[PDB]
């Protein structure tokens, strides 16, 4: 991964919706839970070993391919991308007969 952008943001101020664990009290109930604006958690990830910039480049180089996928499907909203990537990950190793001492077989 060679970052070929004009400039790069070395700092990643990321937000996500995955809970960090240790949910306090009964705040998981939607009635007592936060509004749509306060369900996010934040974090700061610095540029380590040239990762951050590279990540951005990756996104760029992904875009084209992703667009083509969105052209092929007729889903108004596509959520099953990560699941499909996992399925292909499993098929890559265990899709066919797994011959011991083979290149396409991951055993011991």
């Amino acid at each position, epitope marked *: 991964i060679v970052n070929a952008q*004009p400039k*790069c*943001n*070395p*700092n990643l*101020h990321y937000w996500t919706t995955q809970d960090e664990g240790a949910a306090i009290g009964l705040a998981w109930i939607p009635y007592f839970g936060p509004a749509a604006e306060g369900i996010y958690i934040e974090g*700061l990830m610095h540029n380590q070993d040239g990762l951050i910039c590279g990540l951005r480049q990756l996104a760029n180089e992904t875009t084209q391919a992703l667009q083509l996928f969105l052209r092929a499907t007729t889903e108004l909203r596509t959520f099953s991308i990560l699941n499909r990537k996992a399925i292909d990950f499993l098929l890559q190793r265990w899709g066919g007969t797994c011959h011991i001492l083979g290149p396409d077989c991951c055993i011991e």
Partner: antibody
Amino acid sequence: EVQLVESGGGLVKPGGSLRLSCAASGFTFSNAWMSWVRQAPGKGLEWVGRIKSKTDGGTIDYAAPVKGRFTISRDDSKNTVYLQMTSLKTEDTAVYYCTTYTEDMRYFDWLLRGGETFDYWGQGTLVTVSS
Amino acid sequence: DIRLTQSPSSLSASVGDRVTITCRASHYISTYLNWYQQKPGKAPKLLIYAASNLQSGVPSRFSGSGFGTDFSLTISSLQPEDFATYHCQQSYSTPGRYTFGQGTKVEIKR
């Protein structure tokens, strides 16, 4: 690998002129921004001036207590930057440091703000003004 | 235009302690701070650019943090060569008169 050397400092009487020279080696001088930052004995660091590269137009900016009395210039064929001091006042007695804003840190600024991060610092020179 | 205020002004700690210096800004600034190390008699040496980013060659014990108005510099375990005065400088706008902080001088305890 990168080294900067300041020269020209000395004693000058209040109201006189003085010329400071900054020699640089180890990088691409024509693409880097240069800056002068002075340190008073009891006032900490104080930014003096900034000059862009010939690519961005080479516009010059000065500090508020400094405008109208100093003038910055640069020579790319010799990789040198000069600071001229006219109508100098006793409050300008300081240790002057010459700094560079390399092209690599231009690449890390992503919001395209004019401010710069000072990459490398030279030995510095002493400028004393007293009667 | 922009004011930077460091805290504390002086600090005394032992070898191997966790040291934290705070830099506060007057206006809004999104990770334009820079941490410089200046040893007495020598020139300031750039340690941290933007936020939490270490310059090549800086040891791993140095770390930055924070955004917006407040920023934090942290040394995990002090060492004898870390004795120096550290400064925080903003790069959000064209530098004003108070763009460089007054400075925080770290002192080693024995």
